[PDB]
Design an enzyme around this catalytic site. Sequence first.
Site, short mmCIF file in Angstrom:
data_model
loop_
_atom_site.label_atom_id
_atom_site.label_comp_id
_atom_site.label_asym_id
_atom_site.label_seq_id
_atom_site.Cartn_x
_atom_site.Cartn_y
_atom_site.Cartn_z
N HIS A 161 0.82 -1.21 0.00
CA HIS A 161 0.00 0.00 0.00
C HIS A 161 0.86 1.27 0.00
O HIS A 161 0.56 2.22 -0.70
CB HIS A 161 -0.98 0.00 1.17
CG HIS A 161 -1.85 -1.22 1.23
ND1 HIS A 161 -2.51 -1.60 2.38
CD2 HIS A 161 -2.17 -2.13 0.29
CE1 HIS A 161 -3.19 -2.71 2.14
NE2 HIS A 161 -3.00 -3.05 0.88
N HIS A 211 -9.34 -1.90 -4.79
CA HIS A 211 -8.23 -2.22 -3.90
C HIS A 211 -7.27 -3.22 -4.55
O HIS A 211 -6.06 -3.14 -4.32
CB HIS A 211 -8.67 -2.75 -2.54
CG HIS A 211 -7.51 -2.93 -1.61
ND1 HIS A 211 -6.96 -1.87 -0.91
CD2 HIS A 211 -6.73 -4.00 -1.35
CE1 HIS A 211 -5.91 -2.30 -0.23
NE2 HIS A 211 -5.75 -3.59 -0.48
N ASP A 265 -3.31 -2.69 -4.97
CA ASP A 265 -2.33 -3.73 -4.64
C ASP A 265 -1.40 -4.00 -5.82
O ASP A 265 -0.18 -4.07 -5.66
CB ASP A 265 -3.02 -5.04 -4.17
CG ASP A 265 -3.46 -5.00 -2.69
OD1 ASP A 265 -3.02 -4.14 -1.94
OD2 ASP A 265 -4.24 -5.83 -2.20
N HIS A 308 -0.44 -11.21 -4.69
CA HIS A 308 0.94 -10.74 -4.57
C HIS A 308 1.97 -11.72 -5.11
O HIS A 308 2.96 -11.31 -5.71
CB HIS A 308 1.26 -10.42 -3.11
CG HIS A 308 0.27 -9.51 -2.47
ND1 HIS A 308 0.05 -8.22 -2.92
CD2 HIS A 308 -0.59 -9.70 -1.45
CE1 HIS A 308 -0.90 -7.66 -2.19
NE2 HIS A 308 -1.30 -8.54 -1.29
N1 LIG Z 1 -13.71 -6.24 15.49
C1 LIG Z 1 -12.79 -6.59 14.42
C2 LIG Z 1 -13.03 -6.12 13.13
C3 LIG Z 1 -12.14 -6.47 12.10
C4 LIG Z 1 -11.01 -7.27 12.38
C5 LIG Z 1 -10.15 -7.58 11.26
C6 LIG Z 1 -9.46 -7.84 10.32
C7 LIG Z 1 -8.64 -8.15 9.14
C8 LIG Z 1 -7.99 -8.41 8.13
C9 LIG Z 1 -7.22 -8.68 6.90
C10 LIG Z 1 -6.20 -9.64 6.78
C11 LIG Z 1 -5.56 -9.81 5.53
C12 LIG Z 1 -5.98 -9.01 4.42
C13 LIG Z 1 -5.30 -9.15 3.09
O1 LIG Z 1 -4.20 -9.69 2.98
N2 LIG Z 1 -5.97 -8.52 1.94
C14 LIG Z 1 -5.32 -8.49 0.63
C15 LIG Z 1 -4.51 -7.22 0.63
O2 LIG Z 1 -5.08 -6.13 0.53
N3 LIG Z 1 -3.11 -7.29 0.47
O3 LIG Z 1 -2.43 -6.13 0.30
C16 LIG Z 1 -6.32 -8.49 -0.49
O4 LIG Z 1 -5.72 -8.29 -1.70
C17 LIG Z 1 -7.12 -9.74 -0.48
C18 LIG Z 1 -6.49 -11.01 -0.74
C19 LIG Z 1 -7.28 -12.18 -0.76
C20 LIG Z 1 -8.69 -12.11 -0.53
O5 LIG Z 1 -9.45 -13.28 -0.55
C21 LIG Z 1 -9.31 -10.86 -0.26
C22 LIG Z 1 -8.52 -9.67 -0.24
C23 LIG Z 1 -7.00 -8.07 4.53
C24 LIG Z 1 -7.63 -7.91 5.78
C25 LIG Z 1 -10.77 -7.75 13.68
C26 LIG Z 1 -11.66 -7.41 14.70
ZN LIG Z 2 -3.94 -4.56 -0.21
#
Ligand SMILES: Nc1ccc(C#CC#Cc2ccc(C(=O)N[C@H](C(=O)NO)[C@@H](O)c3ccc(O)cc3)cc2)cc1
Ligand SMILES: [Zn+2]
Length: 296
Positions: free
Chosen positions: A78, A237, A241, A264
């Site tokens: 990011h 998003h 990325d 990634h």
């Molecule tokens: N009360 C409460 C509320 C919320 C939480 C929480 C949380 C969280 C989280 C989390 C973990 C990993 C990712 C992630 O790697 N997303 C990908 C990304 O943007 N990479 O840069 C993205 O590219 C990606 C990759 C694979 C996918 O299946 C979806 C998005 C993102 C978010 C805890 C407690």
């Molecule tokens: Zn991301």
Amino acid sequence: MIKQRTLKNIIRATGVGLHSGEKVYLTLKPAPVDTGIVFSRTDLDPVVEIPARAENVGETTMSTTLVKGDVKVDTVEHLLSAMAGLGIDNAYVELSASEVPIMDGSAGPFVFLIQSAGLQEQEAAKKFIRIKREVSVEEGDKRAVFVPFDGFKVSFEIDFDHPVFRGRTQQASVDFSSTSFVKEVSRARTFGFMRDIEYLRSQNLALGGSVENAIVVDENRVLNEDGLRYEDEFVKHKILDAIGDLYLLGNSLIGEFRGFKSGHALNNQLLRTLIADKDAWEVVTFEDARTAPISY
Ligand SMILES: Nc1ccc(C#CC#Cc2ccc(C(=O)N[C@H](C(=O)NO)[C@@H](O)c3ccc(O)cc3)cc2)cc1
Ligand SMILES: [Zn+2]
Ligand SMILES: [Zn+2]
């Protein structure tokens, strides 16, 4: 000529690592011509520097991680997306811990930091990598492609079948001739599926995750009460990325990226695959900015 760009001033921020939950100090600093972006772990003794280049990316399940020996800098995508979007060639990035702070989950806070530091033009031609031939990599049904393009364009398609995604666009093609990275891409927050985030948390991971830095969806609905910053925030998003991962090439791109359910790992494979084949790219400069297919 189109000149290289760095920061005018040193600027700082604090936050927490998404994966580690660890509080981290972040510092962005000006750097000389042809430095590129270089990360420094200033907490270590001696201080360890890792250039933000494709060859230094390690193998991790989540996020793009730079490695040198046993030293890592996690979640660089990011911040690098913001650097790429604002055309920053040269900068030092100091970190007090092994992960870039997640901030609000988007590139917005880093755009703000870079803008606030000020933009300094340097007395050297900015180098661009121009795609000359289409190159692709695949893994299962996932695909990442560089296509020749007289400009800079990023296209992406996600393909979620979960009810929450039904009817959503799940696709975008952004030509930066007429789209603002800052206003239309940079604020797209990271997202995750509730079941997947649960799995991460059960393993004592995603410790920094909260409602303030990620969009969470279950099978059927977006859980975040306020909704979305962009109507198509999810695919935007993914584009964010990709722009960050692509900046590990070390230079701005003249070409198009096309992603299909990519991530990634595949993005980095694409970079290494492109770099290896000298017939597929060239480095160019522009002595007359008016004759350039891009503008910063
Ligand atoms: N009360 C409460 C509320 C919320 C939480 C929480 C949380 C969280 C989280 C989390 C973990 C990993 C990712 C992630 O790697 N997303 C990908 C990304 O943007 N990479 O840069 C993205 O590219 C990606 C990759 C694979 C996918 O299946 C979806 C998005 C993102 C978010 C805890 C407690
Ligand atoms: Zn991301
Ligand atoms: Zn489902």
